[model samples]
Target: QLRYSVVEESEPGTLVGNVAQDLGLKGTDLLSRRLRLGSEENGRYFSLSLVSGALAVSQKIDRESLCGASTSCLLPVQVVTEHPLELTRVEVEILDLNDNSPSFATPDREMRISESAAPGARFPLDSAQDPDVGTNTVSFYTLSPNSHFSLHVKTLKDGKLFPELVLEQQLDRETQARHQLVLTAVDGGTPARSGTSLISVIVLDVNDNAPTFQSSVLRVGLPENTPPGTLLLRLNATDPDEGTNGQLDYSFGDHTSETVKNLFGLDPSSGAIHVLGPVDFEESNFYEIHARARDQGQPAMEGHCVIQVDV
Candidate 1:
């Protein structure tokens, strides 16, 4: 069945359950029958509190070295005494803690991913090792600012979360050859702890992706008596391809006439839209403008949206 438990790394002489009193070798028969606790290997780690009829830790205990990766650690000991009164055995269990962190052995690793691959391939990074077991082991992984990739942590047989990346778009490899990135591994502990490694993504092609927007229609309601430089709102246009191929240029599309363009100014590089010309609620109660986000990929693709303003 089960026995008394103690946490690992406890101080030497730490008091555990009373073995002698519980096993019929109390202070009355203490000196007699010759009570001895522990086997050869367990001797250095544990000791008997003979007079008090209890057991104590002789020295600091290490769960990693003693039990390796085992889930439950039980140290078996025999309580023996002369009188040929021998072999009264008991078990001691060692509990674990997040004393150790999960980490990778090396500093950097490389993944050869296809630039134009539709579905990201399985180039799972090697599972990092954690000395502490259970929830303290690595639980998940994350990557740096990912425009082209996403992390997918898969569970395997062992106590590990394997990290794989999903490609979000056809990458432009020519301009951005090696996408230097960082991969962070973390465990499921309070406040959490993390390990990190360098990831150099060596890729091999086309830019087939268009600019993406968060919304198809942007509805803005603000005061009409605002200044010309009043900041309206910023736009979002993202592309997974790199360099010029992924670079965006925002503008009021053809559907927005020169009159509307004169009233609103859109920054091509930053995608910020600001009021330009005079504005009055009496002149116009509602206004609609077409906006376009264009990327510089070969045969560049564009995403368009409509901005509706109400005073």
Candidate 2:
């Protein structure tokens, strides 16, 4: 048996070697010796010219699945022909090349960061893994420009790159509330290839608006048979702002005392009012209760509305 080597790095048709030259044979000698060469994975990895004795790749051979993160992995080959037993037996070695790429498990990262997060705070970003020899692994992890952020890659097992984004400078949402970063991890190969990811950082924001009511005054008629907890009025309130900034809460105004106060109940979030007590067909049926719509803004803006009901 004999051993020969061929790199699996390039495309199909790459010349492995001239088998005739190594076997001490001539162009006309192949037909007689029946010197046919092949790769036994249904001959998917290699081919050979029987007359010319030149062995070339049949297609791009992949080795990453098995060799991921390992180096110097080899594939076994079986060479045979119709020739006599001794000549038909030989071994061909399929070598690996750093053709595999490094990539994160995800497409991108959207991080919610606090402006109060101090300098030196760390954020995690997944590492990109390349299953090649150390020299073929990521040479460096690079990040895009941003005054508040820095990139640090930790050396992992097999010299892999694990990146942690650091805050070099403390952030202020007033200056900029969001950051978009581009991270690149490249290998040390000729015509180097790399993996890229988009990272988004959102700085926290604050509430700043007051809640407003659609109508400041409203009137409705209530029948004597109206039951308690029945919907009497639904107020329209809105806050022109962001999350929690416009969380409107409804309430009856202070000093809304009168026998009237006991007759209506307000639901804070829904701004709805229901008859809390009995409705009378006559006397004292004409009464009003002032209600306020308040927002969840930091300074908390609020507006009032009046409810008039006739019995």
Candidate 3:
């Protein structure tokens, strides 16, 4: 018995092996020997070069399709010879070629990333696949340009490439709520073939920012005879964080005196300030109040500004 491995689609006239070589015969002796390949059905893919007494591939063999969905294709044959009638078994394995391009198992992938997630965290990604074996399989992966994410690759015991998405920097949903990335997989062919998949990442909101005021202080002039329930000033504050983190509640700070608190009312929902009681210029010509802006986040953060009222 003899075994041979050859890539499919060998040149029509390429010599595979000489049956006479294994029989220990040459020249006229080999020519005179009557040799034939057994099983008439096997003649479709292979034939003997009568002039040289060598076996050769007769037609193109699509290993994948010809073998009926088998990765490893083997052609079995029996070499029959006369003069003393002998039979021998020869197995030819059809190797696969890098004809197919690399492809992703899925058309595309989507994931969610939290803005609070720390850098250096790794996320597993779907690996591309190639029908071809050996170097023809997917050998490397690449990620498109992104400031917050990078590509990492690992090799499996079966020589397949495993790709991962690694976080290189913190994410800010305020700056970018959604991100699109291109992941390309390439095979190690003479002229490499590649495939691409789209990765959509949605950044989840996090309460990582504090409220900010438009200015450090607001100076307003009001007459001592100003009536109650009058809009004294409109306090402005902003929170960059999304969701509840950005929702603000306004009130007077600890430094704000009870007298001042009783005289002024701050709207928790809107940062609006209103005069609650009468202001007498003779009693006090000037008053200073500290207004605080607090957010609705866990371990809430706050910001403050001074309101200087002049009578």
Candidate 4:
């Protein structure tokens, strides 16, 4: 017949039952008796006290490192009497305990995202692992408060938890170029243990803005007899976009009349406005010139400013 006993993992020298008593042996029968486990493998974990015939654990047993996620493990022991060759088998079970915390492989993760990326874009993130079994393992994840990002979680076929970073709002490199967020992983154990990882997000620029002028209307005063090539004023406009999208060029607006277009000179590369034709106060006392600012980006955007010329 076999006997059974239970002990928690990492128990210190826990007594597993008396070997001589279980084998129906008394004090006189133990006089020439020898108690031992069957093999060295079982002896490494359990040992029998020669004098007391008490079976006890030899060293601390780590459930995770020993059984590797197994909730229960067994150690078999055997007792032998030399005088009358007798044997008895006993089994001791090691129960698991929540002793391990969740952890990540790396301390931080770095990523680069383009500003053109739309909402609902997902990016993979490193997952946290716990050596503990069942409910003691990592359960869920949480992300810090942020306006432009969220967290998504998925369970793998192998019973592992995977986390993904999701974009919840639009990205603008001009407004913010970089972001730092904290990702926390919590286990299901009581007084749960948690681990955190730093996420560094770099936002790449995109051509999402158009050129704009500072003022809607600009006032310029010039003499009616000014020379044909005289410099009247310099048009100013600003573009928030980067690279070629912010590069501006000046020209006559669509609404500019043929008479005004031919009368004023506008620099295509620069914003300097000069007198192309002679100005006469008698012909036109006040002239409204429309200047257009265009950028070099594909599907270019334009800004218009009116110049009120007083002769």
Q: Best lDDT goes to which candidate?
A: 3
In candidate 1, stretches whose alpha carbon ends up further than 4 angstroms from where it belongs are 157-159, 204-311
| lDDT tens per residue, model 4, 1-311 | 55656545656578877777777776666666655567657778776777777778888877566678675676666666776677776777776666788898888888899999889999999999888878889999999999999999988898788899999998888999888999999999998998999998999877778778889998878886788788888888999887888899998877778888888888988799888887788888898888889999888888888889999
lDDT of 1 at 216: 90
Q: TM-scores across all candidates?
A: 0.60, 0.60, 0.79, 0.79
Query: Could you tell me the TM-score of candidate 4?
Result: 0.79
- List ranges where model 2 is wrong by over 4 Å: 9-12, 37-39, 65-68, 81-84, 87-102, 131-133, 206-311
Which 10-residue window in model 3 sums to the lowest lDDT?
62-71
lDDT of 4: 0.82
Instruction: Please give the lDDT score for candidate 1.
Output: 0.79
Clashes of each: 1, 1, 0, 0
Worst 10 residues of 1 by lDDT: 119-128
In terms of lDDT, the poorest run of 10 residues in model 2 is 81-90
TM-score of candidate 1 relative to the true fold: 0.60
Segments of candidate 4 deviating more than 4 angstroms: 1-12, 25-31, 154-159, 225-231, 252-270, 274-288
Distance (Å) between predicted and true CA of 128, model 3? 1.5
Q: Give the per-residue lDDT of model 2 (tens digit) for 166-278.
A: 99998766577789999898988887878988888988755444666677778888888988778887889876555776577888888987676777887887877887777
The weakest ten consecutive residues by lDDT in model 4 span 1-10
